[PDB]
Design a protein around this nucleic acid. Structure first.
Lengths: 321, 268
DNA sequence: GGCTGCGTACGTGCGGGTCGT
DNA sequence: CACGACCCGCACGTACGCAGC
């Protein structure tokens, strides 16, 4: 039965080929349509087209059902939004329940190297360091405001400009946002990377000072602009662990910050308060980063000061002197 | 050779699972399919996809304005680099600060921050891009902590966003008062310096003080774990006060070595 | 049970990608 | 700009699951 065989699969060959033709030509026009310029929307990977399509659509879904439309036509100047993009420093993630990054901002390239073109629609846990996957997982569901840290992949490095995925350095992200709902929900966070002390990309102040400590927050060094602000000589604080100066009402949160600093790479602590050499305290926010070899060696801190000094009220046996 | 075949066939299987799941993900996203009686031919499914897509980069600056407002209580403002006078402010200034725009628009940024910050303010205005932290007004004075993020082009453009009966004491292993809360004076009528530099048991009652000593012994013994102790305590009115003190050993997150005993002292 | 239109799932072969020493 | 090293995506041919004159 070769006379039967010739009928069996020839039809299958050319008809399945015909379907494959339909299929393809039907996909690349979906891609063509995409908000992206035809430049790249055209020569785009097969599956990624689906990613971007799905993402785009869901994004518009939650967006529209934030209501936030019925008065959408008139509300603010359009030039100012052009500038609204740029003024931020950090990127925006719109991440679903199961952690599908249905929107990453364009600014992302500038920080993570990777583009949204490569990421929009992909699962978050692919790109995030494990040991964080569960922290993130907590932050993704169930008030509504969110504030935490996560380790994400980066392809830019310290003096490199550009890199590919294989060479994924881990970059730490301060994530701050909300969780909107449309029936299932969606996390909306601004992520901002923490800038390194040696690779300072922005200006400090006299109002902002710098210290170096051991891995247990025992000091190693600090510049002398401390005195002018809070009244301590740097040399009075060297052997001292950092917890002995912390106000009590904060040291729990400071514990959180420190154990984060060990478990991740960097931290931004809350607005805590630190006891002066004499009466009272000063508000403060420290940016901490760990320095390796390869083994953990040091911790360096960019301390931002916020206010002046309960000027007289004594708190610790250091002030009592 | 004989280690690629399996690897690939299973890679392929993974791809099929993944992708067909992409299709059935898109199916319940386009109105037409989700309303439709049953599942349509994949091909026709995404025919419908294209047709719906066209019926609408990724988001307009308006959309993302909306988005990042719903990601941060915050607003945009523009100020001339070295005079301080405000040039623009987004409406979002009102749901963030309670400030009428007729008020905020005329003003100089210096006349809107916390006074002693003005110095720090001009430091951040001397002629890349800049980012820092300040305190701002509230109107109807309780000021609010505002993070700020911007750049330079002439003037500066930026975005501000806000971050969303008892008394506490720290001792060392001996019980020596190391840190003392200020609200203590309400609690027991004492001045912290009359507390710092000396032990705690001499404030406890003669027939209770052992409970203190050996409880501290347990606190350091019970490494990290909480435990409460009730006892009687000399006020400065000579009067005695019952006290539920909850204490636990703080050991350093990295070194797990003692730092101090944290006791939250409550009256009952 | 024939044998065909109609479709989704499995495995292999071929071309164009990126590393690495 | 080489070269097997490959890894990835791609389509082809095909095999099992369901309609119906």
């Amino acid at each position: 039965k070769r006379s039967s065989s010739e009928l069996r699969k020839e039809k299958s060959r050319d008809a399945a080929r015909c379907r494959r033709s339909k299929e393809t030509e039907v996909f690349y026009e979906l891609a063509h349509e995409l908000p992206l310029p035809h430049s790249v929307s055209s020569h785009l990977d097969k599956a990624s087209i689906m990613r971007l399509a799905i993402s785009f659509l869901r994004t518009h879904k939650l967006l529209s059902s934030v209501c936030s439309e019925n008065e959408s036509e008139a509300e603010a100047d359009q030039q100012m939004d052009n500038l609204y993009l740029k003024a931020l420093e950090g990127f925006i993630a719109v991440v679903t329940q199961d952690g599908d990054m249905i929107f990453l901002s364009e600014n992302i390239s500038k920080f993570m190297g990777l583009t949204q073109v490569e990421l929009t629609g992909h699962s978050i846990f692919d790109f995030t360091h494990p040991c964080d996957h569960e922290e993130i997982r907590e932050n993704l569901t169930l008030s509504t405001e969110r504030d935490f840290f996560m380790r994400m992949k980066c392809t830019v490095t310290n003096r490199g400009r550009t890199v590919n995925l294989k060479s994924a350095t881990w970059k730490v992200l301060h994530c701050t946002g909300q969780v909107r709902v449309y029936n299932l929900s969606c996390l909306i966070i601004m992520c901002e990377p923490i800038q390194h002390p040696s690779h300072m990309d922005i200006p400090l102040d006299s109002k902002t000072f710098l210290s170096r400590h051991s891995m247990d927050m025992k000091f190693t060094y600090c510049d002398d602009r401390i005195l002018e602000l809070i009244g301590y000589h740097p040399e009075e604080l060297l052997g001292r662990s950092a917890y002995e100066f912390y106000h009590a009402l904060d040291s729990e949160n400071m514990t959180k910050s420190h154990q984060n600093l060990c478990t991740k790479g960097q931290v931004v602590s809350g607005q805590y308060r630190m006891l002066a050499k004499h009466g009272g305290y000063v508000w403060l926010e420290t940016q901490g980063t760990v320095i390796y070899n390869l083994q953990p060696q040091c911790i360096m801190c960019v301390n931002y000061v916020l206010s002046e000094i309960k000027n007289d009220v004594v708190f610790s046996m250091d002030q009592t002197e | 050779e004989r280690l690629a075949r399996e690897n690939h066939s299973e890679i392929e299987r993974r791809r099929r699972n993944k992708m067909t799941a992409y299709i059935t993900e898109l199916s319940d996203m386009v109105p037409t399919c989700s309303a439709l009686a049953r599942k349509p031919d994949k091909l026709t499914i995404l025919r419908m996809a294209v047709s719906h897509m066209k019926s609408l980069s990724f988001l307009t600056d308006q959309e993302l304005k909306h988005l990042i407002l719903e990601a941060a209580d915050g607003f945009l403002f523009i100020v001339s680099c070295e005079t301080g006078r405000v040039v623009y402010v987004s409406d979002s200034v009102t749901p963030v600060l309670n400030q009428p725009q007729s008020e905020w628009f005329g003003s100089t940024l210096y006349d809107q921050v916390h006074p002693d910050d003005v110095d720090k303010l001009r430091e951040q205005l001397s002629t890349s891009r800049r980012s820092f932290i300040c305190r701002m007004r509230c109107g109807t004075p309780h000021f609010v902590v505002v993070h700020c993020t911007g750049y330079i082009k002439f003037c500066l453009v930026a975005i501000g966003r806000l971050q969303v009966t008892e008394f506490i004491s720290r001792h060392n292993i001996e019980g020596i008062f190391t840190f003392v809360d200020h609200r203590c004076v309400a609690t027991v009528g004492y001045q912290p310096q009359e507390l710092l530099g000396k032990n705690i048991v001499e404030f406890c009652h003669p027939e209770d003080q052992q409970l203190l000593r050996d409880s501290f012994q347990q606190v350091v013994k019970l490494k990290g774990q909480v435990l409460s102790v009730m006892f009687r305590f000399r006020s400065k009115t000579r009067e005695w006060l019952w006290m539920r003190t909850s204490s636990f050993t703080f050991q350093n997150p990295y070194s797990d070595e003692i730092e101090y005993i944290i006791c939250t002292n409550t009256n009952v």
